[PDB]
């Protein structure tokens, strides 16, 4: 179902609506594109523009609040646009960070219309969209050099999300009505280089599963069982993948690992009966 040459500039992200019927591509050309996919067809609708620097990542909001797609660019700003009347418009612009923003994912509709922003400005922001338009932002420093990922943890307070460091550190953050904002929990060390990406699973089974990919060219699957329980570092393999590692994605169900390399190859992984990993 290829959509050959969607952009002019190299593409940095390919995400779909909750109903895999409409896509969203973003590139360096500072532009994002909306799509329609059927059997093998690709209808190109609008092309989102207002981004000064290369767009990095984008994320589809839950249909619960209509059609909304958020994008983050080098321009140190993340922007969201809705699709009222089949015509794409820019609803709000979030630019609190001072430097590139490399990741932006939406919170489980349960939580609400929340967006988690992680900038290379070393900080991270949490923003929910009220009514009138003016939101109440929440920012908290998260890493030394910077921040590269900010995946969320499923619903359960009890609001958690993992961060990937520019300083090689993976962290866990849980809300706190007494602290007024998300505070640190874990600080799982493991990578020798920078944490390129970290995604948290929705697999509600007995134990929690977290993925961490990095310039150190390895994935460390962080498995923990309960509050007490510490996270068990686990090398996806006791060798190095020839190139870096940029993305890690969790399948809806069946909990399978989508590990987008850098050697330009995508690999899939599963945890056999023991607790190790194998292809698919």
């Amino acid at each position: 179902v290829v959509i050959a040459n969607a952009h002019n500039e190299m593409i940095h992200d390919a995400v779909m609506d909750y109903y895999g019927k409409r896509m969203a591509t973003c590139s360096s050309d500072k532009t994002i594109k909306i799509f329609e996919v059927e059997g093998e067809t690709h209808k190109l609708i609008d092309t989102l523009t207002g981004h000064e620097g290369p767009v990095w990542r984008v994320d589809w909001a839950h249909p619960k609040f209509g059609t909304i797609l958020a994008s983050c660019s080098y321009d140190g700003k993340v922007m969201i646009w809705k699709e009222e009347n089949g015509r794409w418009s820019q609803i709000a612009v979030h630019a609190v960070h001072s430097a590139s923003v490399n990741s932006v994912q939406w919170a489980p509709h349960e939580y609400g219309p929340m967006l988690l922003v992680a900038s290379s400005d070393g900080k991270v922001s949490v923003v929910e969209f009220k009514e009138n338009g003016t939101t109440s932002p929440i920012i908290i420093d998260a890493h030394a050099i910077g921040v590269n990922s900010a995946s969320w943890a499923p619903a359960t307070e009890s609001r958690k999300f993992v961060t990937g460091g520019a300083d090689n550190l993976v962290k866990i953050w849980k809300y706190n009505s007494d602290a007024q904002t998300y505070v640190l929990e874990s600080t799982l060390e493991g990578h020798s280089d920078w944490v390129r990406d970290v995604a948290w699973s929705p697999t509600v089974l007995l134990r929690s599963y977290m993925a961490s990919v990095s310039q150190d060219r390895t994935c460390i699957i962080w498995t923990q069982d309960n509050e007490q329980g510490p996270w068990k570092k686990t090398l996806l393999k006791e060798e190095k993948f020839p190139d870096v590692l940029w993305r890690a994605s969790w399948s809806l169900s069946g909990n399978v690992l989508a590990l987008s390399g850098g050697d330009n190859k995508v690999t899939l992984w599963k945890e056999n009966l023991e607790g190790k990993w194998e292809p698919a």
Binding site: V1, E52, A99, D121, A280
Partner: protein, 384 residues
Amino acid sequence: AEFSRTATFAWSHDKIPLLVSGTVSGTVDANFSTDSSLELWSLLAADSEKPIASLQVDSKFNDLDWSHNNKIIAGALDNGSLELYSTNEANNAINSMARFSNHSSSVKTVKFNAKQDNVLASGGNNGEIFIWDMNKCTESPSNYTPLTPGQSMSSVDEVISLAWNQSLAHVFASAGSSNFASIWDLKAKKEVIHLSYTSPNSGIKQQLSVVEWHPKNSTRVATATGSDNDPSILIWDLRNANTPLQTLNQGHQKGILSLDWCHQDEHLLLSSGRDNTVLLWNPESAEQLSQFPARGNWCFKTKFAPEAPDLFACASFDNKIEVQTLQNLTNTLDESKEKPSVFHLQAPTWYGEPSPAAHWAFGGKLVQITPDGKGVSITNPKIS
């Protein structure tokens, strides 16, 4: 962060950037302070107001370069003697090793080699250029004798800029106050080229005070100018040492001082000179990317943290050693410039995500980006 005044730092080589701020030898207090310290710093510690571990020294520094993390810090001191330090594990405690002075009362620059991290370099006043083997150097300070290359022009012009080849531990470059930048082959044991610009278009022999090579190509050196007017960077491709393959023009006003040509990226050149300005250029074409404000006027050193390229520091006789970020975009939160950026700040290559960046989605379909970076791909794999 930001800290104590006057000093010429040197960056480490760990992803947890550490600084070594030895005191410089140019300025003097308003009350003539005296003892240089050689303090150490981390970007984490409480309000970075306290050094990790200092180490009082006799005289003041003229330079400091960290061997390629081999926990060896070379210092060029007031009194023509270089001294190597140790530090037993970053963050722990700075300790001093041997000290030499095979020089003629004057040690100016100190450069450590990339390939063959066991080689060092120093530039004196008699045009003295030495090469020590850090392995058989700690051996006996007896008077261990370093090596000399030998060629063309000297007098009392002190080599005040050392830079190695980033693709052949074999070669390096000398620059001082003369109109000649020297290219050195160590297997040929002797200078092999005389870089020298004079085409100002205003016909004035320009001086080459700084040299920094290209981070990958074995035939490209940066040659900064000294003249307090029409300072330039000039990219030379020794494939032809008669004309600059590129010229970064009209940027600085008064002379230039320091050049750090990024490693992770070859399209990012930092630049500090005799003015209260720090520039970041794109040496491919020559577009001036952004202009960071300076301590006030006159910055000798300015480097990208060797392993944290979005991080750079600016030494300045002005006041203190300032560390900055390659970025600092106008917030929204909080509203003495912040960092005006010309022809953008072209995202650094260590941001180029050719990666297929896949995603699972509705119905077990696996999205992605093809081996052409321009074409998407949707599929449903066999979970088996």
